[PDB]
Every structure is written in structure tokens, then in C-alpha cells.
């Protein structure tokens, strides 16, 4: 059973429990193991406003550079280099949260595509 107000999950969202019984075998004998799973579902609210919003805003700021005139080299260069620096800092910061896993998550794919757009 779970208490009503019993949830300190800031980021996740508890869906429900799922109990099960099994029988494991160790080096000493054969034991009975009671398993209980809590199904969690992460909330995207924080990651949106902290990664997806700055990435999209940076991409838009970078694509603004096309509407400037072609006789203005310093402005467009500043646009490009600042957007690249921002994307780099964001790609470094956002990865810091997760444990050092050896595969590519979805947020990493989004960040990589936004970096490709700024570089383009």
C-alpha cells in the first residue's frame, strides 16, 4: 500500500506497484524472494525549460543571421560564434546531470542536431 500524501518525487511520477514472488538459487541454497516494482514515469517539465528552450532559442538566434545584409561581416560572425559557444556550453552542462553512460540518450540527439544547425 502507498500513503496518499506519501510521495517525495520531485522529478518522477509514481504510476503503480506490481508485486511478484520468485525463487532464487545462491551458492548456499534455494531461497524465496518477494519482488515489488514501482513503475515511475519522468516529468519532462524541467528538461524542457532548461535544455529544449535554450537550444531552440539559440537555433532561432542563429538563423536570424540570414536576414542581415551581406555587407555586415562582424555582426554575422558574432552571431555565429556566440551561438556556437552557447551550444557548446549547453551540450557540456546538460550532459553533466546523467550518470556517465556509454550510449546516446534522446536529449543528446536533440543537442547534436541543434549544434549541426548552428554550424551549418
Amino acid at each position: 500500500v502507498v500513503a496518499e500524501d506519501g510521495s517525495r518525487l520531485n522529478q518522477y511520477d509514481l504510476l503503480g506497484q506490481t508485486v511478484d514472488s520468485g525463487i532464487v538459487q545462491s551458492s548456499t541454497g534455494e531461497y524465496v524472494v518477494m519482488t515489488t516494482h514501482f513503475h515511475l514515469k519522468r516529468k519532462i517539465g524541467y528538461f524542457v525549460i532548461q535544455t529544449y528552450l535554450p537550444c531552440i532559442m539559440t537555433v532561432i538566434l542563429s538563423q536570424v543571421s540570414f536576414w542581415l545584409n551581406r555587407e555586415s561581416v562582424p555582426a554575422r560572425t558574432v552571431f555565429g560564434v556566440t551561438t556556437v559557444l552557447t551550444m557548446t556550453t549547453l551540450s557540456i552542462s546538460a550532459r553533466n546531470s546523467l550518470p556517465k553512460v556509454a550510449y546516446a540518450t534522446a536529449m543528446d540527439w536533440f543537442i547534436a542536431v541543434c549544434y549541426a544547425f548552428v554550424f551549418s
Binding site: N10, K43, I44, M57, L61, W67, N69, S72, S93
Partner: protein, 80 residues
């Protein structure tokens, strides 16, 4: 603005909803981004019309502080 938001968020937990100071920072960043886009619009239509640029500048000079003060008062009224 981005580094201010960064220095602030390092202390708060990872909460999914948007706080009040996050709403304020989003409003300020929208104002700054609209300032930059207004300059981009001026620089785009400056060669075609040299008076439209001065008109947009003279209008923005009195329009931006007004909207900023209005947003400030509405925010401080809704939260305080």
C-alpha cells in the same frame, strides 16, 4: 541573461513546473530577443526604406520601456 539563469538554477532542485523567477527571466529574455529581432528588422528594411528604420527606432524608444513597466507591474501584482 542566460548566465544569470544558470547561476540561479544551480541551487534549486530539478522541479518540473515553472517558478516565478523563471517566469521573470523568461519575460526579460523575450524582451531582449525582441530588441535584437527589432534591430534585425531595421537592418533588413534599411536599404529599401531609410525612413522606416528611423520610424521604427523612434517608436521602439518609447514602446519598449512602456511594455516592460506594464509587465513588471502585472507580475508584481499577480505574485505580491
Amino acid at each position: 541573461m542566460t548566465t544569470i539563469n544558470t547561476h540561479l538554477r544551480e541551487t534549486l532542485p530539478k522541479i518540473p513546473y515553472v517558478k516565478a523567477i523563471d517566469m521573470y527571466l523568461m519575460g526579460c529574455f523575450v524582451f531582449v530577443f525582441m530588441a535584437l529581432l527589432e534591430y534585425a528588422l531595421v537592418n533588413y528594411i534599411f536599404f529599401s526604406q531609410p525612413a522606416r528604420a528611423a520610424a521604427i527606432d523612434r517608436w521602439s524608444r518609447i514602446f519598449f520601456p512602456v511594455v516592460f513597466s506594464f509587465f513588471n507591474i502585472v507580475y508584481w501584482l499577480y505574485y505580491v
